[PDB]
Amino acid sequence: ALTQPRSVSGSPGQSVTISCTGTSSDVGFYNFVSWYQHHPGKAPKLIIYDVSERPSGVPDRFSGSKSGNTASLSISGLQPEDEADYYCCSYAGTYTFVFGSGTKVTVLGQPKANPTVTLFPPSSEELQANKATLVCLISDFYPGAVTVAWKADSSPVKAGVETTTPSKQSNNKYAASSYLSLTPEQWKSHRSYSCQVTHEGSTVEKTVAP
Amino acid sequence: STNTTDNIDYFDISDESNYYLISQLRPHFSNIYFFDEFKRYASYHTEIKRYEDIHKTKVNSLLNEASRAIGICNRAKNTVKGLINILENPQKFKTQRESYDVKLRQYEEKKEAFRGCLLNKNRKNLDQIKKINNEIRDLLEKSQDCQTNVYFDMIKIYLVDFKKMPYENYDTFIKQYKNSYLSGVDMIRKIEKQIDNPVTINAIKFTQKEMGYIIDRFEYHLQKVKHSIDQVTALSDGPKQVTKNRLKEYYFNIGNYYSIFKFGKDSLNMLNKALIHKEKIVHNLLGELF
Amino acid sequence: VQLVESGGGVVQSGKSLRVSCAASGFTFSSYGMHWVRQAPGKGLEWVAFISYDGDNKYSADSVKGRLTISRDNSKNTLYLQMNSLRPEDTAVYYCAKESNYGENAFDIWGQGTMVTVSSASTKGPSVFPLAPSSKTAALGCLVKDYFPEPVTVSWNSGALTSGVHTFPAVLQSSGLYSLSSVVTVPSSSLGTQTYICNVNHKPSNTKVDKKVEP
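C-alpha cells for the assembled complex are given below, as produced in the milestone run.
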C-alpha cells in the first residue's frame, strides 16, 4: 500500500500538494502512476493519468509530477468542490496495480480546532454480563480525519479495535469514536488502558483504570 | 460525436537490425506470448518443469523491463499526441499563429522521434529474447521416438481458440472501411479545387493521412494472423513417432504461430477502436465542412 | 457510459457471493475491466483484471487463490466471485474500466455495491450506559451487539437535542453492530438532572430505556 498523508488542509484560493511513496518497484520504476478523486458517495473519477497529463474534463488547476519513488499531485486555486478523498495508483508490474492509502483534502471553511478526548471505563452493568468495552470519544475537532491508537498498560494493542469515520456535529466540527472489546478477566489483570488521539500532528491521550 | 483523439497507441515500430515488432500494449513483444505458451507445454511435456522457475524470474523480468521502457517515452508520447490533437481540430488549430503546411512537418519529426524511443529503450530487451529462446532450446533437450500426444493435443485446441477471434468479421470490416476511406480522399481532391475552405479540409486530409497508417497496421496483422491460422490448420490436416530434435522444431512451429496469433489479435482489437474513432472524427467534420 | 453493479447485502462467513457489473454505452468486448474494493475504514485497493477476451485474468497477491474473475461478452457483464469470505474483506466493490487514454489507467468507474459479511441472526442490542466524564462533561449511551441496521436513538424521548451525537454503526469481528450516543452537558448541573436514552431496534421489536447516572 502506497503511503500518502492522512489529511491536508487548504484555504479557498490556496495551493496544496500530496506525496505518494510506496516501494522502489511500484512508483519509481514504471512512470505509470495515476491519481483518482473519490467523493463520499459518488464513483471515483480519474484526474491525472501517467505522470503529468490530465483527461479532457479535468481543469487546469490539478497538476501531476513525479521524482524518484515519490509521486506528487498539486491542486492550485482551491474551490469548495475540491474537498474529497484522493488516492494515487501506480502500476505494480506483471499485470497488477497498487493503490495509495488516501488523503482527505479539506477546504478550510473555519479555523481549525483540536479534539477533546474522553475515555470511558467499562460499565458496571456490562461487567456483570461477562463483557467489557472501552469507549474513546473524540469530538469538536476540525478539519479532516484523525488517527487513533490503543495501548494496554504500556504496550500497544492490535486486536479487537474498531474505529468510526469522522462525522459533522451540529456545528461544523467533526466527531468520532473508538471502541475496544476485551474479556473482563483482561480488564482486571492489566494495570491500565489508554487511547492515543493524534490530530493535525498533535497527539493527545487519556487513560482509565479499574 | 468525438472530435479529438485521446488514444494514440496505434503507433508501432520494428527494429532494423533484427526484426521484432514492438507494440505499446502489453506484452509489447510477440515472443512474450511464446514464452507464456511454453509453460503449458512444460506442465504437460514431462516430469521436468524447470520452466516454471524461469517463467517467474526471467520471463516476467523482460515483460516488466519492457513496460518500463515504453513508460520512459511518456514525454515523446504526450508531445506526439499534442501535434495530433492540433491538426485534427480547427478550433484547437486556429489558436496557434502557424499554418497547417508549416506544422504538418513537425508532426512527422515527432512521430518518428517517438517510434525511435519505443525501439531504443527496448533494444537492451531484444537481446534477452535471443537469450531466453536459447535457454528454452537448451532446457527442452533433457530418444529417437519421443511422444507426440501433447503436440497434437495443442493443435486440436488451437483451432477452437482461433474461432474466438472474429477474422471473417474483421476482414469484411477492412474492405468496406478501406473503400469508404478511398471515397473520402477522392471527394476532397475535387472540393479543395473548387471550394475555398482550407482550414477544415486540412484536418480531413490529415485525419486520412493517419487513417492509412492504421489501415496498414490493421491489414498487416490480419494476413499474418491468417497465415498462422492457415498454417496451424495445415499442421493438423497433414504420425505419433518423432525425434527429440524435431520436437524442438515442432514446438517452435506451434509456438511461433500461436504467439503471433495472440499478439496480432491484441493489435487488431486496439486498431479497431482506433479506426472507428478516426472515422467519427472525419464523419462529424464533413458536417462542419459542408 | 454507465457501469452498474449489483451485490448482496449480507453473506455468511466462509460462504460465496457473486458480484455482477453490467456495462453499457460503450463496446464492452473491446475494453479491459478491473475490480476495486474499498473497506469502510481503509481506502480502495486494486483487486483483479481481465483482458477484453477473457484469456488473461490476474488478481492481487493478497486475494490470490481466493477470488475468481470472469466476463460474459455476450451478456455484457463483468463477474467477480469471492469464496471463503472473512469479516475483514467486507467492502464496497467498484467496477473499473480500462482507460481510453491507455491501459495503465482507469477511465470510468462503477457506483460500488456494499457487501457485508455477517453470519449471525437477528439479535437484540444490549444498552449499557456511559457515566459522565469530565472534558463540561460528557455522558454516553452504548448500544452494542445488534443486528441488523438500523437502530433509532433519542435522548429523553426528544426532550433534549442539543449537544447530542449519534455515531454511525460499526461491524465487529462477530458480525454484530455497535453504536454509542453521547451528550455533552455542563458539569455543574449533572447531579440535578438525570438522562435516559431511548433505544428502539425495530427489526427485533426492541425498545430499551436506560437511566444514566454516575
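Residues 116-208 of chain A form a domain with the Immunoglobulin-like fold (CATH 2.60.40.10). Chain A is about 5% helix and 45% strand. Further analysis is deferred to the final report.
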